[PDB]
Amino acid sequence: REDPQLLVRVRGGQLRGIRLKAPGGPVSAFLGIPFAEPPVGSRRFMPPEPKRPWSGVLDATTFQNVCYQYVDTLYPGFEGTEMWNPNRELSEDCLYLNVWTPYPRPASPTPVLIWIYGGGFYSGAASLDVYDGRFLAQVEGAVLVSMNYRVGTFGFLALPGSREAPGNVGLLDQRLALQWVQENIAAFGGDPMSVTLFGESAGAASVGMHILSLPSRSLFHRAVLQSGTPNGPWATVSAGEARRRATLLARLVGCPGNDTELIACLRTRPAQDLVDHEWHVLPQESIFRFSFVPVVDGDFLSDTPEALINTGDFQDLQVLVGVVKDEGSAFLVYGVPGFSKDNESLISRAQFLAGVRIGVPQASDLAAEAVVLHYTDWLHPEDPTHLRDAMSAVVGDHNVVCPVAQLAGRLAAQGARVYAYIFEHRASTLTWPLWMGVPHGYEIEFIFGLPLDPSLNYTTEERIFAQRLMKYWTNFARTGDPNDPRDSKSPQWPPYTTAAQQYVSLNLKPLEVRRGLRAQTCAFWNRFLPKLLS
Amino acid sequence: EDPQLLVRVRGGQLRGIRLKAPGGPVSAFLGIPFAEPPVGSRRFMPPEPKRPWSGVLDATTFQNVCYQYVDTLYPGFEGTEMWNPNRELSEDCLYLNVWTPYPRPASPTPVLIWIYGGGFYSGAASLDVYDGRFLAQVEGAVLVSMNYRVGTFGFLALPGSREAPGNVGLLDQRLALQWVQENIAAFGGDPMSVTLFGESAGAASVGMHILSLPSRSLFHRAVLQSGTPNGPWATVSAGEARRRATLLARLVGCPNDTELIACLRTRPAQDLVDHEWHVLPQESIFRFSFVPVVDGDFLSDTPEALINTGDFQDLQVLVGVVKDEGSAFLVYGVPGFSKDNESLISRAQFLAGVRIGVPQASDLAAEAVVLHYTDWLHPEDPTHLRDAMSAVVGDHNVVCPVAQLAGRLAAQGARVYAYIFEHRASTLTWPLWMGVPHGYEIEFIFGLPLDPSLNYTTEERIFAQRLMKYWTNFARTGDPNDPRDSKSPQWPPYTTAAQQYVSLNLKPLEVRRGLRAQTCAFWNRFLPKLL
Ligand SMILES: Nc1ccc2c(c1)c(-c1ccccc1)[n+](CCCCCCc1cn(CCNc3c4c(nc5ccccc35)CCCC4)nn1)c1cc(N)ccc21
Ligand SMILES: Nc1ccc2c(c1)c(-c1ccccc1)[n+](CCCCCCc1cn(CCNc3c4c(nc5ccccc35)CCCC4)nn1)c1cc(N)ccc21
Ligand SMILES: *[C@@H]1O[C@H](CO)[C@@H](O)[C@H](O)[C@H]1NC(C)=O
Ligand SMILES: *[C@@H]1O[C@H](CO)[C@@H](O)[C@H](O)[C@H]1NC(C)=O
């Protein structure tokens, strides 16, 4: 007979989980629990349907398939890229979620943290090493949930107004997993009335979209957005632009005239064919743009995220938001001429002006000259190191820092309690070059508590640092406040407000309170640049 | 009869006056005619050289101030009255002044020629702050200053006409320069070492002589203080001068060009000054009605075209700005601002003040300005908005045009030295929030603190001595550095690569790099692209 602590029933049917080892002791894991009917065949591009009950004991001891997606090839064998690549078989049959709980399971209901991965809505998996829930579960006593959701065409290809491809199905997958937690998480000792969404990059943008979409609001109570927002230039597309891209992809794969016929033809296409042409539909040469993303349908998103944050009422809402020191750096090697991970990437002024057009593709001649003039150091306008770093900052500011600044300000102006951070610590184990600093994605391993595994080779200080961070995030999940109530002396993390614009540095040093989140530069992007795009 | 006070110039004999300077005597020759009075039919015309005279011409007093507007915003207040005419007003005002050491220098001495400011609508070489006494006495310099015609009389133009060709006020200055070439040797001045210096409009004038071929054989070096020939206020197009002239003429009941000018010539001087202000195209500050015109003659092209393409290889230039170029202008039109209170303005008042500080700015352009100068951490702080409104006006009109001139001259072979003047005169009567306003360095360059009776601090006296040394070292050699003092900190030339300039204040020279580089990139490269 089996460990009595690993047998659990959901709506659902019977699950068998696995006792996993964490540094401080054991955790329970239920991996690869199906939450939808496999979205395959006639069902590609369609909203997810709830999983039908099964008979017997479903084995929930291993991660399940990763959703069909582009696999990164730019640097073969390189940990810097491979750590984000799929670590299970690619299949369209990928709608599974994972649960980590303390072992034995908690006696009284426990706060639930739901992770939503990033990958620009074209990639990602809940099964990646950096999303391992065992540490938060073992150390903080948290119930941690993560779901696979369809990406790329499978998740976001839309012919807006159609029945067969309405768009945003990837978000609907996420919503279904959240409904699943509501009905079922109490079986694992989680408290459905205390659910905090967190996510990074497109996951952050996803979390933000759940805040902005009414049918999702009853499904969670708090939200954390790491290095991503639902507003900004990459996280959504207009209905018209989504139609354009789906139509073009359709022709690239020999699918010519109503929507039914088109979509039917797309459905007969092999999954890999779609991935192989996914990238060809982008309107300009660009970086930090992705082909198939959330669409402003007038349904899931009733209006543009910009409009919904300017007019929304956010009184009952608590959000932790923030950014890493170098959001843009690692994007630069994916299409700006002159940039590489294998050299120092010192660029010329010409390579900088060309970079700007690629980093801000939307983005008239006048508008680009404004960006260049703003980011030039007029004391040393030809210095290749400053040019390199400005190119990085341009991409980081435009896509993450300033959309986050805008979000924090709007939410705080409209009733929300907002906490804001900038994460500035570079993992000792990073394999990206030094010049990239603290790239997009490299706080995640610290929030999840990876440094606690002695076999990963983080420094002792990093181990203590990760413990601090896990404490902030889960204090926030519990109470809506990252601070410790008992711990008087430790420096306080004040709320971000419009008046004082306070946020904290997260690094090896104790908390330092800073004011204004690149306030001057973000006034350029948020306030000015729109106006010379009229 | 003191033989030291008796000089023969080309047009006849002069008698000067021995004046007292704190260190000892100087010889002054004041009110020397350098032109036929520009009166009657000669109004608006180029100056003619003064006819020779009999006997000994009395040159012991300042002569009339050129006909001009007299300031009436704060009547009897030192801060304004000090720029007002201190002699009788007359159209008969083409005279100049020479201060020389006493006894007259043994060997040929460098000559400094002062060209006053006042927006081309006012000014006079007779003001207390332009007193050449001290430079003559302490440094052994021969100092010259001329009156030149201002407002309508100096710069009313109907371009391409014979009778009002424009720029005659600048021709007045050129004639005084010629007079120096012909006559200064008689005083012990070296006509081969002439340095022009000027402030505000006087600085813009200096720059116009730099950019006009016929003036170039009349001087060797130049100092432009808080003013430039390029930039938004110092010139107007032919088309715009014609419109203002026509408008003025219509405003005074006048009347082809000949006829219109003839009628203008019948009008009493005060009638022209009465309506001078109503020809401006917009509610504005730091804009002046009658200023030099791009005539294709004196100025062959815009100062902007001319500085971009000129050869400046055998030229040495000293340029600079004061710490608060625009503070004092704000009380002359921007709602919210007065000298009698702290002028703590609202945001609304800031956006409205920008439309006035940058009158030529579109809605979008003005937005860019506001967004640039707002402090986004304290977007509604009255003190910040007040200081920023000042900054807008100072950067737009003075600092950034100075930065553009400096870079252009340096790139094109000139030797350039730059400064920022940061000492507020203890005796200043303007309020504290104005900081170091436009015009308040001249005092120190001319050496007034050396007069014990004016109540400057000891520090202030020593500081003015330093400054007089930089200016005269510069006049003497084209280099402001003291060639005897074998200690630092050296004043380095301004260059396009390094962009070095120095702070002039009570502390020793500090070398700084980049003269508001980020901000001036905004004004010099970006803002034009919006238009
Ligand atoms: N010749 C081709 C053909 C097809 C595709 C190609 C190129 C590219 C491409 C590759 C290299 C250079 C330019 C373009 N691309 C583009 C891939 C570039 C996308 C950006 C990679 C990136 C870089 N960063 C910042 C650093 N950290 C991360 C990553 C990655 N993922 C994550 C996910 C979450 C958080 C962080 C993180 C993945 C890769 C490396 C770093 N995030 N994402 C395609 C994309 C498709 N969806 C489909 C097909 C193709
Ligand atoms: N209602 C009227 C009618 C006619 C005129 C009026 C107003 C004005 C005016 C006065 C107050 C507010 C708005 C408008 N104005 C405007 C004169 C004010 C313009 C500039 C004042 C100024 C302020 N600063 C800075 C501080 N230092 C100086 C000065 C002044 N001159 C100089 C000269 C050289 C160096 C410095 C300097 C003179 C004034 C005060 C300070 N420089 N110049 C007129 C002008 C004309 N040419 C003819 C008519 C009129
Ligand atoms: C770095 O390498 C890339 C491609 O291999 C190249 O384009 C770039 O010129 C290199 N940069 C430097 C500074 O050598
Ligand atoms: C950590 O360091 C050890 C050497 O003690 C080495 O054997 C191992 O490969 C390293 N682990 C990782 C994940 O880099």
CSV table of N, CA and C in Angstrom, one decimal, chain A residues 94-209:
chain,number,residue,atom,x,y,z
A,94,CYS,N,-1.8,19.5,-24.0
A,94,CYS,CA,-0.9,20.1,-23.0
A,94,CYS,C,-1.6,20.8,-21.9
A,95,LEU,N,-2.9,20.8,-21.8
A,95,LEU,CA,-3.6,21.5,-20.8
A,95,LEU,C,-3.6,20.8,-19.4
A,96,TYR,N,-2.5,20.9,-18.7
A,96,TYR,CA,-2.3,20.2,-17.4
A,96,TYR,C,-1.8,21.2,-16.5
A,97,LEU,N,-2.0,21.0,-15.2
A,97,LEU,CA,-1.5,21.9,-14.1
A,97,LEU,C,-0.8,21.1,-13.0
A,98,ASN,N,-0.1,21.8,-12.2
A,98,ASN,CA,0.7,21.2,-11.2
A,98,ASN,C,0.4,21.8,-9.8
A,99,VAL,N,0.5,21.0,-8.7
A,99,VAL,CA,0.3,21.5,-7.4
A,99,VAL,C,1.4,21.0,-6.5
A,100,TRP,N,2.0,21.9,-5.7
A,100,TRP,CA,2.9,21.6,-4.6
A,100,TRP,C,2.3,22.0,-3.3
A,101,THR,N,2.4,21.1,-2.3
A,101,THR,CA,1.9,21.4,-1.0
A,101,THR,C,2.9,20.9,0.0
A,102,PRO,N,2.8,21.4,1.3
A,102,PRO,CA,3.6,20.9,2.3
A,102,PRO,C,3.3,19.4,2.5
A,103,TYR,N,4.3,18.7,3.1
A,103,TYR,CA,4.1,17.3,3.5
A,103,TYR,C,4.4,17.2,4.9
A,104,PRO,N,3.5,16.6,5.7
A,104,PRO,CA,2.1,16.3,5.3
A,104,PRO,C,1.3,17.6,5.0
A,105,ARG,N,0.2,17.5,4.2
A,105,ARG,CA,-0.6,18.6,3.9
A,105,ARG,C,-1.1,19.4,5.1
A,106,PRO,N,-1.2,20.7,5.0
A,106,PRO,CA,-1.5,21.6,6.1
A,106,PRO,C,-2.9,21.3,6.7
A,107,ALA,N,-2.9,21.4,8.1
A,107,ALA,CA,-4.2,21.1,8.8
A,107,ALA,C,-5.3,22.2,8.5
A,108,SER,N,-4.8,23.5,8.5
A,108,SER,CA,-5.7,24.6,8.3
A,108,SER,C,-5.5,25.3,6.9
A,109,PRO,N,-6.5,25.9,6.3
A,109,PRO,CA,-6.4,26.3,4.9
A,109,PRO,C,-5.3,27.3,4.7
A,110,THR,N,-4.5,27.1,3.6
A,110,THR,CA,-3.3,27.8,3.3
A,110,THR,C,-3.4,28.7,2.1
A,111,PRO,N,-2.8,29.9,2.1
A,111,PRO,CA,-2.7,30.8,1.0
A,111,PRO,C,-2.2,30.1,-0.3
A,112,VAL,N,-2.8,30.4,-1.4
A,112,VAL,CA,-2.5,29.7,-2.6
A,112,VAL,C,-1.8,30.7,-3.6
A,113,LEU,N,-0.7,30.3,-4.2
A,113,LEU,CA,0.0,31.1,-5.1
A,113,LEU,C,0.0,30.4,-6.5
A,114,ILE,N,-0.5,31.1,-7.5
A,114,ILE,CA,-0.7,30.5,-8.8
A,114,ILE,C,0.3,31.2,-9.8
A,115,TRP,N,1.2,30.4,-10.3
A,115,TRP,CA,2.2,31.0,-11.2
A,115,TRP,C,1.8,30.9,-12.7
A,116,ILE,N,2.0,32.0,-13.4
A,116,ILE,CA,1.7,32.0,-14.8
A,116,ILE,C,3.0,32.4,-15.6
A,117,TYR,N,3.6,31.4,-16.3
A,117,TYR,CA,4.9,31.6,-17.0
A,117,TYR,C,4.9,32.7,-18.1
A,118,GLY,N,6.0,33.2,-18.4
A,118,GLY,CA,6.3,34.0,-19.6
A,118,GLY,C,6.9,33.3,-20.7
A,119,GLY,N,7.4,34.1,-21.7
A,119,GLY,CA,7.8,33.5,-23.0
A,119,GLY,C,7.0,34.2,-24.2
A,120,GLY,N,6.7,35.5,-24.0
A,120,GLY,CA,6.1,36.3,-25.0
A,120,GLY,C,4.8,35.8,-25.7
A,121,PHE,N,4.1,34.9,-25.0
A,121,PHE,CA,2.9,34.3,-25.5
A,121,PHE,C,3.2,33.3,-26.7
A,122,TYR,N,4.5,33.0,-26.9
A,122,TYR,CA,4.8,32.0,-28.0
A,122,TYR,C,5.6,30.8,-27.4
A,123,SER,N,5.9,30.9,-26.1
A,123,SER,CA,6.7,29.8,-25.5
A,123,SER,C,6.4,29.8,-24.0
A,124,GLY,N,7.1,28.8,-23.3
A,124,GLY,CA,6.9,28.7,-21.9
A,124,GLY,C,6.3,27.3,-21.5
A,125,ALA,N,6.5,27.0,-20.2
A,125,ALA,CA,6.1,25.7,-19.7
A,125,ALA,C,6.1,25.8,-18.1
A,126,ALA,N,5.1,25.2,-17.5
A,126,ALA,CA,5.1,25.2,-16.0
A,126,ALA,C,6.1,24.3,-15.4
A,127,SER,N,6.6,23.4,-16.3
A,127,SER,CA,7.5,22.3,-15.8
A,127,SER,C,9.0,22.7,-15.8
A,128,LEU,N,9.4,24.0,-16.2
A,128,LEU,CA,10.8,24.4,-16.2
A,128,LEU,C,11.3,24.4,-14.8
A,129,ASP,N,12.6,24.2,-14.7
A,129,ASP,CA,13.3,24.1,-13.4
A,129,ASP,C,13.2,25.4,-12.5
A,130,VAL,N,13.2,26.5,-13.1
A,130,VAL,CA,13.1,27.8,-12.4
A,130,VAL,C,11.7,28.0,-11.8
A,131,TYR,N,10.7,27.3,-12.3
A,131,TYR,CA,9.3,27.4,-11.7
A,131,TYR,C,9.0,26.3,-10.7
A,132,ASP,N,10.0,25.6,-10.2
A,132,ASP,CA,9.9,24.5,-9.2
A,132,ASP,C,9.2,25.0,-7.9
A,133,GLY,N,8.0,24.6,-7.6
A,133,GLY,CA,7.3,25.0,-6.4
A,133,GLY,C,7.8,24.4,-5.1
A,134,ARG,N,8.7,23.4,-5.1
A,134,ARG,CA,9.0,22.7,-3.9
A,134,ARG,C,9.6,23.6,-2.7
A,135,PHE,N,10.3,24.6,-3.1
A,135,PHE,CA,10.9,25.5,-2.0
A,135,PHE,C,9.9,26.4,-1.3
A,136,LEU,N,9.1,27.0,-2.1
A,136,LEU,CA,8.0,27.9,-1.5
A,136,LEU,C,7.1,27.0,-0.6
A,137,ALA,N,6.7,25.8,-1.2
A,137,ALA,CA,5.9,24.8,-0.4
A,137,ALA,C,6.6,24.4,0.9
A,138,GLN,N,7.9,24.0,0.8
A,138,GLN,CA,8.5,23.4,1.9
A,138,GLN,C,8.8,24.5,3.0
A,139,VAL,N,9.4,25.6,2.5
A,139,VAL,CA,9.9,26.7,3.4
A,139,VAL,C,8.8,27.6,3.9
A,140,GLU,N,7.9,28.0,3.1
A,140,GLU,CA,6.8,29.0,3.4
A,140,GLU,C,5.5,28.3,3.8
A,141,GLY,N,5.4,27.0,3.6
A,141,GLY,CA,4.1,26.3,3.8
A,141,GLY,C,3.1,26.7,2.8
A,142,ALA,N,3.5,27.1,1.6
A,142,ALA,CA,2.5,27.6,0.6
A,142,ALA,C,2.0,26.5,-0.2
A,143,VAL,N,0.7,26.7,-0.7
A,143,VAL,CA,0.2,25.8,-1.8
A,143,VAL,C,0.5,26.6,-3.1
A,144,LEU,N,1.3,25.9,-4.0
A,144,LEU,CA,1.7,26.6,-5.2
A,144,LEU,C,1.1,25.8,-6.4
A,145,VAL,N,0.5,26.5,-7.3
A,145,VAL,CA,-0.1,26.0,-8.5
A,145,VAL,C,0.5,26.6,-9.7
A,146,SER,N,0.7,25.8,-10.8
A,146,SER,CA,1.0,26.4,-12.1
A,146,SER,C,0.4,25.6,-13.2
A,147,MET,N,0.0,26.3,-14.3
A,147,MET,CA,-0.7,25.7,-15.4
A,147,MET,C,0.0,25.9,-16.7
A,148,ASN,N,0.0,24.9,-17.6
A,148,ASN,CA,0.3,25.1,-19.0
A,148,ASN,C,-0.9,25.8,-19.6
A,149,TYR,N,-0.6,26.7,-20.6
A,149,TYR,CA,-1.6,27.4,-21.4
A,149,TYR,C,-1.1,27.5,-22.8
A,150,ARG,N,-2.0,27.4,-23.8
A,150,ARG,CA,-1.6,27.4,-25.2
A,150,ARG,C,-0.9,28.7,-25.6
A,151,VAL,N,0.2,28.6,-26.3
A,151,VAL,CA,0.9,29.8,-26.8
A,151,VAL,C,0.9,29.8,-28.3
A,152,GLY,N,1.5,30.9,-28.8
A,152,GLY,CA,1.6,31.1,-30.3
A,152,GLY,C,0.3,31.0,-30.9
A,153,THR,N,0.2,30.5,-32.2
A,153,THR,CA,-1.0,30.4,-32.9
A,153,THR,C,-2.0,29.6,-32.1
A,154,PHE,N,-1.6,28.5,-31.5
A,154,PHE,CA,-2.6,27.6,-30.8
A,154,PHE,C,-3.3,28.3,-29.7
A,155,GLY,N,-2.7,29.4,-29.2
A,155,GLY,CA,-3.3,30.0,-28.1
A,155,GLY,C,-3.9,31.4,-28.4
A,156,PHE,N,-3.4,32.0,-29.5
A,156,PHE,CA,-3.7,33.4,-29.7
A,156,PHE,C,-4.1,33.8,-31.2
A,157,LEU,N,-3.9,32.9,-32.1
A,157,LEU,CA,-4.4,33.2,-33.5
A,157,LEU,C,-5.8,33.5,-33.4
A,158,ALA,N,-6.2,34.6,-34.0
A,158,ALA,CA,-7.6,35.0,-33.9
A,158,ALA,C,-8.1,35.6,-35.2
A,159,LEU,N,-9.4,35.2,-35.6
A,159,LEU,CA,-10.1,35.9,-36.6
A,159,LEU,C,-11.3,36.6,-35.9
A,160,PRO,N,-11.1,37.8,-35.3
A,160,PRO,CA,-12.0,38.4,-34.4
A,160,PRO,C,-13.4,38.5,-34.9
A,161,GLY,N,-14.4,38.0,-34.1
A,161,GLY,CA,-15.8,38.0,-34.5
A,161,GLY,C,-16.2,36.6,-35.0
A,162,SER,N,-15.3,35.7,-35.3
A,162,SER,CA,-15.6,34.3,-35.7
A,162,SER,C,-16.0,33.5,-34.5
A,163,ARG,N,-16.6,32.3,-34.7
A,163,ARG,CA,-16.9,31.4,-33.7
A,163,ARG,C,-15.8,30.4,-33.5
A,164,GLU,N,-15.1,30.1,-34.6
A,164,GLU,CA,-14.1,29.0,-34.6
A,164,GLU,C,-12.7,29.5,-34.1
A,165,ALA,N,-12.4,30.8,-34.1
A,165,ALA,CA,-11.1,31.3,-33.7
A,165,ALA,C,-11.3,32.7,-33.0
A,166,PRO,N,-11.9,32.7,-31.8
A,166,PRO,CA,-12.3,34.0,-31.3
A,166,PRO,C,-11.1,34.8,-30.7
A,167,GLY,N,-9.9,34.2,-30.6
A,167,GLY,CA,-8.8,34.8,-30.0
A,167,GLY,C,-8.8,34.6,-28.4
A,168,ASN,N,-7.6,34.9,-27.8
A,168,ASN,CA,-7.4,34.9,-26.4
A,168,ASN,C,-7.7,33.5,-25.7
A,169,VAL,N,-7.6,32.4,-26.5
A,169,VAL,CA,-8.0,31.1,-25.9
A,169,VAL,C,-6.9,30.7,-24.8
A,170,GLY,N,-5.7,31.1,-25.1
A,170,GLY,CA,-4.6,30.9,-24.1
A,170,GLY,C,-4.9,31.5,-22.7
A,171,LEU,N,-5.6,32.7,-22.7
A,171,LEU,CA,-6.0,33.3,-21.5
A,171,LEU,C,-7.2,32.6,-20.9
A,172,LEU,N,-8.1,32.1,-21.7
A,172,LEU,CA,-9.2,31.3,-21.3
A,172,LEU,C,-8.7,30.0,-20.7
A,173,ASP,N,-7.6,29.4,-21.1
A,173,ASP,CA,-6.9,28.2,-20.5
A,173,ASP,C,-6.6,28.6,-19.1
A,174,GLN,N,-5.9,29.7,-19.0
A,174,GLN,CA,-5.5,30.2,-17.7
A,174,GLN,C,-6.7,30.4,-16.8
A,175,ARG,N,-7.8,31.0,-17.3
A,175,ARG,CA,-9.0,31.2,-16.5
A,175,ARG,C,-9.6,29.9,-16.0
A,176,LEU,N,-9.6,28.9,-16.9
A,176,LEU,CA,-10.1,27.6,-16.5
A,176,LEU,C,-9.3,27.0,-15.4
A,177,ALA,N,-8.0,27.0,-15.5
A,177,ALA,CA,-7.1,26.6,-14.4
A,177,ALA,C,-7.4,27.3,-13.1
A,178,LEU,N,-7.6,28.6,-13.2
A,178,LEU,CA,-8.1,29.4,-12.0
A,178,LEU,C,-9.5,28.9,-11.4
A,179,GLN,N,-10.4,28.6,-12.3
A,179,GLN,CA,-11.7,28.0,-11.9
A,179,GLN,C,-11.4,26.6,-11.2
A,180,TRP,N,-10.6,25.8,-11.8
A,180,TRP,CA,-10.2,24.6,-11.2
A,180,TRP,C,-9.6,24.7,-9.8
A,181,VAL,N,-8.8,25.8,-9.5
A,181,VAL,CA,-8.3,26.0,-8.2
A,181,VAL,C,-9.5,26.3,-7.3
A,182,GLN,N,-10.4,27.1,-7.7
A,182,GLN,CA,-11.6,27.5,-6.9
A,182,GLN,C,-12.3,26.2,-6.4
A,183,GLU,N,-12.6,25.3,-7.3
A,183,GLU,CA,-13.4,24.2,-7.0
A,183,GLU,C,-12.6,23.2,-6.2
A,184,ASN,N,-11.3,23.1,-6.4
A,184,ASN,CA,-10.5,21.9,-6.0
A,184,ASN,C,-9.4,22.0,-5.0
A,185,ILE,N,-8.8,23.2,-4.9
A,185,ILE,CA,-7.6,23.5,-4.1
A,185,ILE,C,-7.8,23.1,-2.6
A,186,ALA,N,-9.1,23.2,-2.1
A,186,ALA,CA,-9.3,22.9,-0.7
A,186,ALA,C,-9.0,21.4,-0.4
A,187,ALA,N,-9.2,20.5,-1.4
A,187,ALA,CA,-8.8,19.1,-1.3
A,187,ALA,C,-7.3,19.0,-1.0
A,188,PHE,N,-6.5,20.0,-1.3
A,188,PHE,CA,-5.0,19.9,-1.0
A,188,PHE,C,-4.7,20.8,0.2
A,189,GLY,N,-5.7,21.3,0.9
A,189,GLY,CA,-5.5,22.1,2.0
A,189,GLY,C,-5.2,23.6,1.7
A,190,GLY,N,-5.4,24.0,0.4
A,190,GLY,CA,-5.3,25.4,0.0
A,190,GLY,C,-6.6,26.1,0.3
A,191,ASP,N,-6.5,27.4,0.5
A,191,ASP,CA,-7.6,28.3,0.8
A,191,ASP,C,-8.1,29.0,-0.5
A,192,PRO,N,-9.2,28.6,-1.0
A,192,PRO,CA,-9.6,29.2,-2.3
A,192,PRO,C,-10.0,30.7,-2.1
A,193,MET,N,-10.2,31.2,-0.9
A,193,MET,CA,-10.5,32.6,-0.6
A,193,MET,C,-9.3,33.4,-0.4
A,194,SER,N,-8.1,32.9,-0.7
A,194,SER,CA,-6.8,33.6,-0.6
A,194,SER,C,-5.9,33.1,-1.6
A,195,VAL,N,-6.1,33.5,-2.9
A,195,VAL,CA,-5.4,33.1,-4.1
A,195,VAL,C,-4.7,34.3,-4.6
A,196,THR,N,-3.4,34.2,-4.8
A,196,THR,CA,-2.6,35.3,-5.3
A,196,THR,C,-2.0,34.8,-6.7
A,197,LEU,N,-2.3,35.5,-7.7
A,197,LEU,CA,-1.7,35.3,-9.1
A,197,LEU,C,-0.3,35.9,-9.1
A,198,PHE,N,0.7,35.2,-9.6
A,198,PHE,CA,2.0,35.9,-9.9
A,198,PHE,C,2.5,35.3,-11.2
A,199,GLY,N,3.3,36.1,-11.9
A,199,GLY,CA,3.9,35.8,-13.2
A,199,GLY,C,4.9,36.8,-13.7
A,200,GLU,N,5.6,36.4,-14.7
A,200,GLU,CA,6.7,37.2,-15.1
A,200,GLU,C,6.6,37.4,-16.7
A,201,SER,N,7.0,38.5,-17.2
A,201,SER,CA,7.0,38.8,-18.6
A,201,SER,C,5.5,38.6,-19.1
A,202,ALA,N,5.3,37.8,-20.1
A,202,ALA,CA,3.9,37.5,-20.6
A,202,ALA,C,3.0,37.0,-19.5
A,203,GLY,N,3.6,36.3,-18.5
A,203,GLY,CA,2.8,35.8,-17.4
A,203,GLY,C,2.3,37.0,-16.6
A,204,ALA,N,3.2,38.0,-16.4
A,204,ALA,CA,2.8,39.3,-15.7
A,204,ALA,C,1.7,39.9,-16.6
A,205,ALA,N,1.9,39.9,-17.9
A,205,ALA,CA,0.9,40.6,-18.7
A,205,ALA,C,-0.4,39.9,-18.5
A,206,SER,N,-0.4,38.5,-18.5
A,206,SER,CA,-1.5,37.7,-18.3
A,206,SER,C,-2.2,38.0,-16.9
A,207,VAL,N,-1.4,38.1,-15.8
A,207,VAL,CA,-2.0,38.4,-14.5
A,207,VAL,C,-2.8,39.8,-14.7
A,208,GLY,N,-2.1,40.7,-15.3
A,208,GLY,CA,-2.7,42.0,-15.5
A,208,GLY,C,-4.0,41.9,-16.3
A,209,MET,N,-4.1,41.0,-17.3
A,209,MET,CA,-5.3,40.9,-18.0
A,209,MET,C,-6.4,40.2,-17.2
